[PDB]
């Protein structure tokens, strides 16, 4: 599987409204979240990954070894905890977050320097795109 290490700048998103509602995020917080352009930073070493979502209001970091289910602390996101498993399906990094919310998870994949992210919760599907930042001193 590919190595996903990189810093990727926000490009676009669609239907984040839907995903936020599906996680039961309040109107006040959804209004804030829809204004921001969070970046994605990944540290992928061997079979271990750290994935950071970075914004001026709040950051969220998760760590994992691919293939090992773990308790994901999402209390800073939607107040919940999940039993989360990340796998590789061809070149897609697939995450299933098992818990209260059905169909919860996400999928990354790369096309050149564009990093795609699909986010799901209940019947909501959000599509995001990021672009890798080149290491220019
Ligand atoms: C400010 C605030 C507050 C709060 C609470 N909020 C916000 C916002 C904005 C800011 C940002 C934060 C971070 C998040 C993370 C998760 C997703 C990604 C992910 O999943 O990823 C995936 C891979 O890549 C790893 O992980 C938001 C959004 C945009 C969304 C959401 C849900 N939100 B929330 F409701 F949490």
UniProtKB/Swiss-Prot annotation:
UniProt feature coiled coil, ranges: none
Main localization, broad class: cytoplasm
Localization of this protein: Cytoplasm
GO biological process: fatty acid transport
GO cellular component terms, A-Z: cytosol; extracellular exosome; nucleus
Family: Belongs to the calycin superfamily. Fatty-acid binding protein (FABP) family.
This protein's name: Retinol-binding protein 5
Gene that this sequence comes from: RBP5
């Amino acid at each position: 599987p590919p190595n996903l290490t990189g810093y990727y700048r926000f490009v676009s998103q669609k239907n984040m409204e839907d995903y936020l509602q599906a996680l039961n995020i309040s109107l006040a917080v959804r209004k804030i979240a829809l204004l921001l352009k969070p970046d994605k930073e990944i540290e992928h070493q061997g079979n271990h990954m750290t994935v950071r979502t970075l914004s001026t209001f709040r950051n969220y970091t998760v760590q994992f070894d691919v293939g090992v289910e773990f308790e994901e602390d999402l209390r800073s996101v939607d107040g919940r905890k999940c039993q989360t498993i990340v796998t590789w399906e061809e070149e897609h990094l697939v995450c299933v977050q098992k818990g209260e919310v059905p169909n919860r998870g996400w999928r990354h994949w790369l096309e050149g320097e564009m990093l795609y992210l699909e986010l799901t919760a209940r019947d909501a599907v959000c599509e995001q795109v990021f672009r890798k930042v080149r290491l220019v001193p």
